[PDB]
Paper text:
The inner membrane export gate protein, SctV (InvA in SPI-1 and SsaV in SPI-2), is the largest component of the injectisome and is essential for assembly and function of T3SS. Consistent with other reported SctVC structures, the SsaVC monomer also has a four-subdomain (SD) structure and further assembles to a nonameric ring aligned to SD3, which is the most conserved region of SsaVC.
Through a cryo-EM single particle analysis approach, we reconstructed and classified two conformations of SsaVC: one 3.55 Å cryo-EM structure with double stacked nonameric rings with D9 symmetry, and the other 3.64 Å cryo-EM structure with a single nonameric ring with C9 symmetry, the particle number of which are approximately comparable. The double-layer ring conformation of SsaVC is considered to be an artifact, consistent with a previous study. Notably, most of the C9 single-layer ring of the SsaVC particles were calculated from top views, and most of the D9 double-layer ring of SsaVC particles came from side views.
Author numbering:
A (entry chain Q), B (entry chain R), C (entry chain J), D (entry chain B), E (entry chain A), F (entry chain E): 346 to 681
The structure:
Amino acid sequence: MVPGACPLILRLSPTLHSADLIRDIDAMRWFLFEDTGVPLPEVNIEVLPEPTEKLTVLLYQEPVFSLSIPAQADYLLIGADASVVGDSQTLPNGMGQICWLTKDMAHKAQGFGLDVFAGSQRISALLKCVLLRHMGEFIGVQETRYLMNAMEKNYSELVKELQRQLPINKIAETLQRLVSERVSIRDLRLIFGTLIDWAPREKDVLMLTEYVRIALRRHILRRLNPEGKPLPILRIGEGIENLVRESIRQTAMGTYTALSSRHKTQILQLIEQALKQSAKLFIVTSVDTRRFLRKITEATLFDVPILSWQELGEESLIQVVESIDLSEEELADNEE
Amino acid sequence: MVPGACPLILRLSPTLHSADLIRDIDAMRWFLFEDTGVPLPEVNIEVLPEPTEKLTVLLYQEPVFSLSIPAQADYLLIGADASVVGDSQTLPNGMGQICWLTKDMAHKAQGFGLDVFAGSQRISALLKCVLLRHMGEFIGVQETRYLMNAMEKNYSELVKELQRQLPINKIAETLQRLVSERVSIRDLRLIFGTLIDWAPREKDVLMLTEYVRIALRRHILRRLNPEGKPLPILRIGEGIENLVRESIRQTAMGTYTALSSRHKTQILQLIEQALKQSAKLFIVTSVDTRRFLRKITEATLFDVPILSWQELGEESLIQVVESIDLSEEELADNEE
Amino acid sequence: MVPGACPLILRLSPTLHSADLIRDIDAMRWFLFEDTGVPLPEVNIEVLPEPTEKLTVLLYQEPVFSLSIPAQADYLLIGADASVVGDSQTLPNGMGQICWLTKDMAHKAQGFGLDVFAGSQRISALLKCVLLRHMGEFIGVQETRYLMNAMEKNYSELVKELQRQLPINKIAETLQRLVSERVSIRDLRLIFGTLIDWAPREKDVLMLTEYVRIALRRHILRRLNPEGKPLPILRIGEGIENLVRESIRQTAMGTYTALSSRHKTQILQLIEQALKQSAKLFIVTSVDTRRFLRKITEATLFDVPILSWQELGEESLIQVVESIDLSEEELADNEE
Amino acid sequence: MVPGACPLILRLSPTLHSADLIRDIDAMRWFLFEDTGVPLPEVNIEVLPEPTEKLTVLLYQEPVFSLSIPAQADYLLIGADASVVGDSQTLPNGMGQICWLTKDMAHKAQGFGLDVFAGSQRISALLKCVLLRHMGEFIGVQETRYLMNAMEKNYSELVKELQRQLPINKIAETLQRLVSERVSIRDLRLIFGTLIDWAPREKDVLMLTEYVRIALRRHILRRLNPEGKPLPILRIGEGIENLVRESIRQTAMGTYTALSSRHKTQILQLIEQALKQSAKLFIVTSVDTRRFLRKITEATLFDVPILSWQELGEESLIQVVESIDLSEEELADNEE
Amino acid sequence: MVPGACPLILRLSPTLHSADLIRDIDAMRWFLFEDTGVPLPEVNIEVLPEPTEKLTVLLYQEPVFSLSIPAQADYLLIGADASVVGDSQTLPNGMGQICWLTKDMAHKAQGFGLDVFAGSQRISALLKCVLLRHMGEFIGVQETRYLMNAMEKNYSELVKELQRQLPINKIAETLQRLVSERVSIRDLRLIFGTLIDWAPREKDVLMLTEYVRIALRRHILRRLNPEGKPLPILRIGEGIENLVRESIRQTAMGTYTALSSRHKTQILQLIEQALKQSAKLFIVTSVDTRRFLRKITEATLFDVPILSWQELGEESLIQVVESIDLSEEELADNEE
Amino acid sequence: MVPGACPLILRLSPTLHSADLIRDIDAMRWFLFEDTGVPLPEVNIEVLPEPTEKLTVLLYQEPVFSLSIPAQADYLLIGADASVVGDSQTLPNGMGQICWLTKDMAHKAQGFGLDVFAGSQRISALLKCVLLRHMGEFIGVQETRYLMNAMEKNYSELVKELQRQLPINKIAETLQRLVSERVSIRDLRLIFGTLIDWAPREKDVLMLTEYVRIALRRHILRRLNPEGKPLPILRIGEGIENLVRESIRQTAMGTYTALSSRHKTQILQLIEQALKQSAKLFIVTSVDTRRFLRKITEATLFDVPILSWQELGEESLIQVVESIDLSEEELADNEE
C-alpha cells in the first residue's frame, strides 16, 4: 500500500505493444523536456487485455485518455488540412484531429511536407499530444525543488539568492503559471534572474509571472512562429481593455478581476466568433489587461495564445487582421 | 535531463569546420575578456549537416544568429566603407554590414589599413560580433559571484567590505548595467572602491551605476576614441534636459522617468534624423538627465553611446556638431 | 582569465631594455615608499616591439603614459630652468617639462648643481614622474588593510583601537585624501593617534582628514621647503573666505560647498592669473575654508599646494607676495 | 549501465499475457518459499512480440527455458500417467513431461484426482517447474546474509553465535548444498543449532551438511512421501560401499573421492538399469559413503534422492526392492 | 595539461558525420555492455578535415583503426560469404572482411537473412568491430573497482566477502583474463561466488580464472552457438596434451608452461593447417592442458575459441571433425 | 633568496623577442606534452642585451644551449638532406644540423614536403630541440607525484593500488628510465597497470621498466615509424648476446653488467662503423641482453633506439640490413 498515485501509466493491448516502444517513449520524453523544460516522470507500460485495439493514458491513476485505434488504419497523421482527407476523427477533450492514412496516401502526405508516423511512433505522437495538454500538472512544489537542486550544480549562488528572496511555493506557482501557457521554462537562469530582480519590488505572484514572461519575449515570439514571417494578430480594442481595467480589485495577496458573467460570456462568444475566420490568431492586448483577460479565457479557449504589446517589440510588425471592440453590457450594450 | 540551458553553442556545416577553430575561438574569447571584462563561457562546437554553407549561434539554446555564407566569398571584412564595395550584406538584428571580398581585392583592402579575415577567422570575426551584441546576458548573479570569488585572492578585504555594504543582487545589477553600455568592468578594484564609497550615501542602483561610470570616465573616453583627436559631439539642448528632468518620479526603490509616448517618439525620430549626417556621434547631455535619456533610447538606438558632461573632463575639447533642442509636445509643440 | 587588472606595467621597445633596469626600478620604488609612504605594487617589465624608441606606462591596463624618446638625446633632465635650454618637450597630462641634453652640456648641468640621469635611470626618472601624478590610486581599502596588518606587528593595540573607532572604509578614505595632496602617510603612528583622538568627536571624514593634516603640519612645512628659508606665500583675502564660508551646506554625512559655476571659474581664472608671476606659490587660506577651496581647485590646479593658517605655526614667517580678494559675482561684481 | 544481471525474467508473447498473472506468479513464489525455504527474487514480466505462442524464462539474462505452447491445447497437466494420454511432449533439460488436454478430458482428469491448470495457471505451473530445477542458484552469500538478517529479529543470539562459529561463506556453502538436494532450509533455527553444535568439532563443510541433513531426517522422510505408506527402497550393496569408502582422499580442506572413470560409468549405467523397473526409487547407502555417491550421480541423475541409513530411523520400514552390488573394475570385474 | 590519455576517440571527415550518430553510438555501446559486460567509456566524436572519406578510431590516443571508406559504396555488410560477393576488402589487424554493396544487391542480401547497415550504422558496425578486438583493454583495476562499487548496491555482502578474500588486483586480473577470451562478465554474482568459493583453496590466478570459466560453461556454450545444433569440434590428441602437461613448471606465484619454440611453431602451423578445412572450429583439449595451450595460441590465433572437456557437459554431443596428434620434436619427430 | 633553481629560462636579445612568442612557446610545450607525456615547466622569457643576435637556453640556471643566429638567415629548417643545402651548421652537444634558408629556397623546400619555420617559430623549433635532448631531467620524484595527483581524479583506485605496491621513488625511477629512451609516458593507465601486475613478482626496477616497455610495444613501434612501411633493422648476433649475457652479476638490489672496457670500446666502435652505411638503424637484440646493451651505449649513442625481439611482434617484418657478431676480446679476439 504505497501512498501517492503512480504518475504516468500507458495501458496497451498486447497487439499494440512492441520492442522499440521503450526507446521511442524515452525519445519523446527527451524531446518534450528540451521543448517545454518540464522533466516528465517515467512512463509505465502496462498491458490491457482487450479484443479491440485500445490504449489508455492515466495521469495519477485517473484515466485522461482512452482511444480505440481502428485496425484498418496503419499510418498516423496528427491534425487535418485540405491536402489530406480521409479516415479522420476528433480526439477527446479537444486535443485536435487525427487522420489514419493508407500506406500510399501517407507516403504522398509525407512527400507533401508533413510528419507521418508509423509503428510504435503512432503511440508516441498520440501520447505526446496528451502530455502537451496536461503539462502544467507535472510542475509542483516537489518538481520545482528538483529543478532547483539540479541548478545548484553550476548556479549555486543564483539558487541561493532566489531562495533568500522567495519561498519555494511562490517559485513553484510562478513556474506552474508559466508552463500552463506554453511558455518554456527551459531557460532557468533567466527566470531566476528576473525573479531575483523583481522579487523585492513585487508581491503579486501573477505580476512576477508577467515580468518573467516579458523577459522571455524573444523566446515566446520565436516559438509561436519559428520563421520571421508575419503571422496574423487580433487586436483587442480600447473598450474591452477599459472594461477589464476598471474592474481590478486588490487584496493583501494581490489584484484580481471582478466582472459580470454576462461580460465574460459575451467576450468569449465574440472571440470565438472572430476565431473561425482563420485557423491561427494571436490575441494581443495591453500589459495591464493581459493576464486578467487570460484568466477569463483559459477555461474554454486554452490553446489560443494571449500575447501582450510589450511582448511584441518594435522589431515585430503587426499585420492586424481584426479589431475587436465593445462597450459594457449591464449598464448599456452600446456595442453588443 | 540536465536543467539549465547550454550557454553558448556554435553549429557549423562540416565544410566550415576546421582544425584550428578551437584555438581561434579561444583567442577570440580571451580578447573579449581582456576588452570587456566579462568571462565568457566555453563555446560548444556542434556539427549541423546542411548542403548549404550555414552556421548558427545559439545563446542558451535560443538561436540568436543564423547566417548562410556564400561559396563565392572566401575573404571576410566586417563593416563597410567607400574604399571597398562589392558582395556586401546586412547582418540580422542590426549587427552591421559584412563584405565578402575576392583574394586580390581583400589583399588591397588589407593594404589600405583595415582588418581582413580568412579561414577559421571568418567564423570568429562573425561569432565575436554576435557576442558583442548580447554581452549583457553573460553577467548575472552567478557570474558576479564568480568574479568576486576571483577577486578574493588578492583583494580579500575589498570584496569583504563590498559584501558588507551591498547584497550580491545589487552588485550584479550594477555590473550588468555597466556591461550593457559597452563600459568595461575589467577594472574591478576601482568599481568595488566606488561602490564602497557611495553605497552608504545612495540606494538607487541606477545612481550607483552613474557614479561608477563617472569614476571610470578616463577609460570610457579612451575606449570611445583611442587617439587623442577630437571626435564629433552632439549636444542635447536645455529644452530636452528640462523636459526629462521635470518628469522624474521617485518611489522607495529609486527614481524613474514618466514621459508621454509622443515625447519619446519625437525625441528618437529627431535623433535618428540628426544621426544620418555623420557615421559616428556621441550624444552628450547633463548628469541628472543622462541615464533617463539612455533608457528612452536603449530599445532602438542600442549602439550609440550616451555620454555625460561630467564624464568629459575639462581636458577634452568638444567640437559640437549639432545642437538638438525642443519644447514640449502635449501642451504645445513650440519646436516640433 | 584572472579578474582584476594588472596594477603597474612598463612596456619598452628592444633598445631601452637593460640588465640593471630591475634594480633601478626597485630602488625608485623604495625611494617613493620612503617619501610618500604608499607601498607600490611590482612593476611588470614587458617588451613592446616598435621601430621607434617608445615606452608606455599602464596603470591597471589603461595606458596613462606614452612617450617616444628621440635617439639624438642620451642625457635626461627633468624640469626646465634658465641655465639649461635645448631639446626640451612637454610631458603629457601636464606632468611637466623634460630636457634631452648632450653629454658635455649634461655634465655642465650636473656641475651646475642639478640631477641628470643617464642609462636605465632615464626610464626611472620618467616612470617615477608618472607614479607621482596617479599616486592616490595606489591606496584603497585593500592597501589600507595591508598597511594596518603591517602595523599590527609593533602597534597591535593602536590598530585595534583604531578599528574599534572607525570602519576600514573611512580609514581608507582618510589615507586616500591625505595621499592625493602630497602629504606623506609614512608616519602611521601619528595618523592613527589623531584618528583615535578625533573619531568620537567628528563624523565628517573630510574634517578628520583636516585634523590629521594639522597634526602633520611640521612634516608638511618641512617637505614643501627642505631649508628654513622663507618661500613665497599667496594669501587669500577675506572676500573669498567669506564667499566660500557662507555657502557651506551640511547633510547627515557631513558638510560640502555649493557655489555658482561663475564663482569657481572666476576664482580659478584669477588664481592662474596670480600664479604666472612666480614659479612656486603656496596659497594660504583659513582653516574653515581650506578644504572646500581645495575641492574647487583640485581638478585643474592639482600640483599647487593649498596650505592653511593653522598649518603654518607662529615659527614660520610669511613673506606675503600677493593678496587676492573678491566680492561676489551673481549678485554684483564689486571686485571683478 | 547497471552491473549485475537481472535475476528472473519471464518473456511472454501478446496472447499469453493476462491481468491476474501478477498475483498468480506471486502466489507461486510464496508457495515455493513455504516449501523450499529459498526467498525467490521478483519475476519481471516482459512482452516478447512473436506470431507463435512462445514464452521464455531467463535466469540472470541467460535463457534457461524456451517453450512454444500450441494453440490447440488450453488445459495443462504436468507429468504423465496411464490414465491420461494425448498431446504430450518432453520438457527441455529433462524437467519432465507435460500434457495439453481438451476441456472435457481435462475435467475427467481433474475428477480422477490430479491437478489440472487453466489460464494464467498454465504459466505458473510451467515457470514453477523451471524454478524447481535451478533452485540452488538462488542461494549464495548475499541471500544467506539476507536470511541471517531476517533471523536477527527473533533469534539474535542464535545468529550471533553462528557468526562467531563459522564465516558467512561456509554457511552459504552449507545452505546451498542443502538446497541443491531438495532439502528445505525453511527450518533455520534447527539448521543454525546443528551448525553451532558441530562447527567446533568439524571443518569439512560437506560433513557439516551431512550432520544438518541427519538432524533434518524427519522432514526429509516426510517430504519424500507425505503419507506413512512404505515406498520402494533400492539398497546399495557392500561392494559399492567398500569401493567408494576405500578411495577417500583427504586434504587440509576436507575429504573427497578419487575413483576411476570406468567405476563411475559402470555404477551410473547399472543404476539407470535398475531405475527403469519402477518410476520412483530411493537409493539408500551408508553414512560414510552417501555424499560421495551423490557427487558421482548429481551430474546425470539429479532428480533421484540419495538417502542414507541414519536418515531412515528405526520407525521407517524398508521394503527393499533391489540390492545392487559390485566388485571393482580395473583390477578385475568379478561382478560386471 | 591533463595526465591520462583520452579513452576512446572517433575522428570523422566532414561528410561522414551525422545527426543521429550520437544515439547510434550509444545504442552500440549499450549492446556491447549487455553482450560482454564491460562498461565502455564515452566515445568522443572529433572532426578530421580530409578530402578523402576517412575515419580513425583512437584508443588512449594511439590510433588503432584507420579506414578510408570509398564513395561508390553506400551499403555495408560485415563479413563475407558465397551468396554475396563484390567490392570487398580486408580490415586491418585481421579484424575480418567487409563488403560495400549497392542498394539493390544490399536489399537482396538483407532478404537472404543477414544484417546490412546503411547510414550512421555503417560507422557503428565498423567501430563496434574494433571494440570487439581490443575489449580486454577496457577492464583494469579502476574499471573493476567501478564494477564492484556498482555491485555494492544490491550485493553488499558478496562484494565485502570477495574483498576480504582477494585483493583488487587479483580480481581485476581474473576479470581481464575472462574478458580477453570472449567470455562475458555480465553475470558478476556467479563470478564473485566462484571466486569466494575457490579463493581459499587456490592462489594461481590462472586457475581461479579456469574455475570461473568452468562455472560459466552453460553461458559459454550458449554464446558460441545460440542454437542447439551441433557445431564442429577439433579434438586435441593425447600426444599434445602429454607434451604440454609434462612441461609444467611451478613457482611461488603459480604454474607456467616451458616449451621449445620448435614445439610451439609446429603446433600452431598444424593447427592453422587443420583450420582451413572449415570456417569455424572449436579446439577442445583437457582441463589441465587448456589454459597453457591458449597461451601458446593467443598471440596469433586470437579469434579461435579454446574450449575444454569439462566445459562441455554430458548434454553436448561432440561430432569430432579432426583429431590432431603429435609426438615431440627436439628428441625425435615420430609424428611431424 | 629562494632555494631551488629556476627550471627553464630562455634569454633572447631584444631583436629576437616578439609579441607572439608567448603563445608559440605555449603551443610547443603543449605539443611536447602530447607527444612525450612529460609536463614541462613554464618557460621564463628574459632579455639578454647583446649586439650579436644570440639566444641561450638555461636548465636550472646551468646554460645548456647557446646559439648566435646569423642576420643573413631568416628561414629555419631543422636537419639536413640532399635536396636542400646551404648555410648549414652543427648544433652543439650533437643535437643535429640546422639550415638557414633564403626566402625563395625555403619556399621551395616547404613545397618539397618538409617543415620550414619563420619568425617566432625559429625560436620554438630551436628550443624544442633542446627540450627533446634533456627531457629525462623534467621527471623526478616531485613531477611523478604531480602526475599521480592528476591521475587521482578519474583513476583513484589505480593510483591507490600502485602506491600500495611501490614506493614513489621506484615509480619515479621507472618513469624516468622510460622517458630517457624516447618512450612516451602519456598512457599512464597502462603503465600503472603493468607496474601493478609485475610489482609483486619483481624487485629490479630495471626489469619493471623492461616489462612496461614490452607492454607499450605497439606505441613504440608506431612512434619509431608512423607508416607501416618496413624500416631497416640491425640485428645483434649471438656472440655479443652471449658475451653480455654471461657477465650478468646480481646483488640484493638487482642485476647489472660487468664487462671489460675493451669489450665496450670495441662494441661501440663497430656499431658506429655499422651506423654510417644508412642514416637510421634500429638495433635489435634479445630481451635478456637489451637493457644492458643500452647502458653500454647510452653515454655516446643516445639517439639510436635499442629495440628488442619481444617488442617487435610477429606482425612486424624485419628486413635485416646487417648482422653484427663478435667473439670475446681479452681471452682471444676470434672476430675482431
